[PDB]
Ligand binder design. Sequence first.
Ligand SMILES: O=C(NCc1ccccc1)Nc1ccccc1C(=O)O
Length: 228
Amino acid sequence: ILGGREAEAHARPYMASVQLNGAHLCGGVLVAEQWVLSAAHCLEDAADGKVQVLLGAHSLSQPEPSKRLYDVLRAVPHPDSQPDTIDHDLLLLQLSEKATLGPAVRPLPWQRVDRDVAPGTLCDVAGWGIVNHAGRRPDSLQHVLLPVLDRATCNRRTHHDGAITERLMCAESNRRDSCKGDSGGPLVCGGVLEGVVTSGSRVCGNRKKPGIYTRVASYAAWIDSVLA
Ligand SMILES: O=C(NCc1ccccc1)Nc1ccccc1C(=O)O
């Protein structure tokens, strides 16, 4: 997260770190007792690798009573996802067992009504992704508030130009933005999950290249089907 601030410890009980061979890779969001939602491209790079999900965490490295590492029973990438498209970029991880719920570990309700978040709405994005332009990695969860940027605008030419479908939403990236390593994590507006940070490569913190977030309401049948 660029241009943000350290998050209040455990104030986002839904926040997950998706890890590969013991290291943070991508964010993710606890959406049911046994299921974490993240981005598919994060795990394109993976089959030779143990995937785990850290819940209840603020620090990546220090112990905390609430902090618990869960093995993964199943990774389920969206069926229409492909390398080199930003579209359908979601992944569901089934935890090995139901997460132990408490004040620090709780699922986030997510948007099921397929209507865009109004332009200018301030939404919150959190992650353990890079915090500057050098590539520095924080130990502790960071977060930033970003205004949603209308789709009509996001499709303009010196922007993202053509790609942004009805299943994607955009937010401003003017010095405050999500970046590499924040992919898969939550964009939350009025306390509901609205988007998941996309995992394509892109520059961070440049006003001319807005953040892209996959709209979870667009995918509500698929998410229901997987959990069922
Ligand atoms: O390499 C990644 N994380 C490494 C990291 C850890 C901590 C901070 C910063 C970076 N993640 C990805 C892997 C494949 C495709 C997309 C992404 C992605 O994050 O968009």
